[PDB]
Each structure stands twice: as structure tokens, then as C-alpha cells.
Amino acid sequence: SGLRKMAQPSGIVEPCIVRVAYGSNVLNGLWIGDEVICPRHVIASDTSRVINYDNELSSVRLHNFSIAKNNVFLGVVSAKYKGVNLVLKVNQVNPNTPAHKFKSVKPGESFNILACYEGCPGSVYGVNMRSQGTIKGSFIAGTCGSVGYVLENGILYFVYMHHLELGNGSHVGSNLEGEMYGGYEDQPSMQLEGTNVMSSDNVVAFLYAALINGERWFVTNASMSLESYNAWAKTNSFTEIVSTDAFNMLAAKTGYSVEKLLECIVRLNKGFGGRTILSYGSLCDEFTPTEVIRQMYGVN
Ligand SMILES: *[C@@](O)(CO)[C@H](C[C@@H]1CCNC1=O)NC(=O)[C@H](CC(C)C)NC(=O)c1cc2c(OC)cccc2[nH]1
């Protein structure tokens, strides 16, 4: 038993991380095949002020890139923007390149961050994408270009590359196509996140996790229909439930219908009144149904 926010193991990704520096800027890149992908602001003269990315590319010089992995130095032979990333063709193929694909995550989906510090993998942790496209992580100077990934059916997907932190502390990055999640600009900007909408699917999963753990104080003699819940969600900054297929196994194994837990959400969102659930003091939307099934029952 127990519920922990976890990451899938990082070994397959670690050999792909390099240090990328240009001028006084230092961050991380992803070395796969004979390409290094990194945030394009590494070439900007002054990242503390609004950047004209046209001007920074016009004045770039390929020789000024410093790219390294331990005692391997990589020379850049071509540089392009691909969205908000640089794609740098280098003079050596990474012999440890794993088989991989690219995909974009969606709001409510979980993935893993390999947090990298000026080219050195430092830590690994799980995240969940918020409705506005942000994540809540722990990123500091030197961590841009840290990589998000997910393993799904024996396939490694690269899904995220880190760029910035909003004034409210939320973390912003791009897919590996260089499309910023949420559409935020790669600028030092007071751009606003927008209103956060909780993932109902994930809150339901969290309550199922508490039931699996043997905690059931919060369940009442009541149950809310799906249309009723969805009408409430729309006015209370929760997502509408579009399918209950993700909960069939959880309902079957716990004996509790999704509608019982929908009633719990509406009631608990008013406050836990000093109680906790899985030691939390408020509802948590960080765990997907898949995450809960996998770590609590060991299947899928
Ligand atoms: C990368 O390491 C840079 O290479 C860095 C990561 C952030 C540092 C603190 N937490 C992080 O996630 N990214 C930045 O420093 C970016 C660089 C931009 C995109 C060119 N800037 C910010 O994240 C940033 C600047 C400002 C700001 O200014 C003015 C005002 C409000 C928020 C804000 N975020």
C-alpha cells in the first residue's frame, strides 16, 4: 500500500544529456543521433530583457557553441530554430541514442522530468500537466533544456523541454517540435498563466487510491450523476468527465462507483475540515488513473 508521486526510471535518458553553452549562457541539450536540441534562448545576448530572436540568430556563429558530455566535445555544423528550440547538427552521433519517438502530452497527463543542471542530470521526478499547459516542478538557473519523457508500451517518448517560469511560479516548456505548451512566449514576461482547472479524472483516481489504501471516512451515503457533476464542474473550475472507462478496474476492485466519488469531490472541495486523505489536506489532481492502478495493483 501507499501512494507516492513517482517517475519512471531515467537510465535510458541520462546518456542523452549534454551541456550547451553560448557566450555567458549555460543550459542543457538533448543529444540524439547527430543532433542536439536545446532552448533557443541560449544564443541570446541578454535573457533578462525581451529578445529579438531574429537578431540573435543573425549574429550567431556556429563556432561559438560549446557542447560537452564529460570529455566529449561536440562541434556544431548546422543550427536552425525549430519553434522555440535550436536544433544543432553536431559532428558525432551519440552512440547511446535510444530508440525513441516524439509526442505531445495533454492537460491531465503525467510524465517524468529529468532535471539537469548545466549538462549534468541531477534528479528525476514525476509531473502532471495543468489545464493551461504548465507543470509544477522545481526548476532553477541552469535547468533549461531539462527533458520530459514517458515510457508507454516499451516505447520511449520525448515530450517536454524546459524553458521558463511564470511570475506565479508555474513552469513552462515545449514539446520537442518547439511548440510551447500553453502558447506562452519564450520571453522574460509577466504573461499570466490563466485560470487553473482541476482534472476531475485525476481527483477521482486520488480518491480511489485512498480507498485502496483502506481510507474511507470521506465516503457518504450519497452519489452524484455524471451530468450533474459536469454541470457543477463547469462552474467550479474542474474538468467535465467525458468517459468513465478509465475507472472500470478501480471501481471493480474497490467496489465503489465513480458517482460516489463525484459526490465526494463536490463535498470535499468545500474543505476537509481538519481531516486528511492519504495525509493530504486538500484534493490532489496530480495522479492519473493509470498511475494509481500501476503502483497500487501492479498492472497495465
Ligand atoms: C533557464 O535555465 C534559462 O536558460 C531558465 C529557467 C528558469 C529560471 C528560474 N526558474 C526557471 O524555470 N529560464 C529563464 O531564466 C527564462 C529565460 C527567458 C525565456 C528568455 N526566463 C524566465 O523564466 C523568466 C523571466 C521572467 C520575468 O522577467 C522580467 C518576469 C516574470 C517571470 C519570468 N520568468
Author numbering: 1 to 300
The article reads:
Due to its indispensable role in viral replication, evolutionary conservation among coronavirus genera (alpha, beta, gamma, delta), and absence of mammalian homologs, Mpro stood out as a promising drug target for developing pan-coronaviral therapeutics. In this study, we present crystal structures of Mpro from the feline coronavirus strain FECV-UU23 in complex with four clinically relevant inhibitors: GC376, PF-00835231, nirmatrelvir, and ibuzatrelvir. Our structural findings reveal that the active site of UU23 Mpro maintained conserved catalytic residues in addition to distinct, lineage-specific structural plasticity, especially in the loops forming the substrate binding subsites.
The warhead (P1’) of PF-00835231 covalently bound to the catalytic C144 and formed a hydrogen bond with G142 in the S1’ subsite. The indole group (P3 moiety) of PF-00835231 interacted with the backbone atoms of E165 (S3 subsite) through a hydrogen bond. Enhanced vdW interactions with L164, P188, and S189 from the S3/S4 subsites and F139 and L140 from the S1 subsite likely contribute to the tight binding of PF-00835231’s indole and glutamine mimic γ-lactam moiety. Despite variations in loop conformation and sequence, the binding mode of PF-00835231 in the active pocket is highly conserved (RMSD < 0.2 Å). As a result, the warhead (P1’) and γ-lactam moiety (P1) of PF-00835231 were completely buried in beta and delta coronavirus complexes, whereas in UU23 Mpro, the wider active site resulted in the inhibitor being more solvent-exposed.
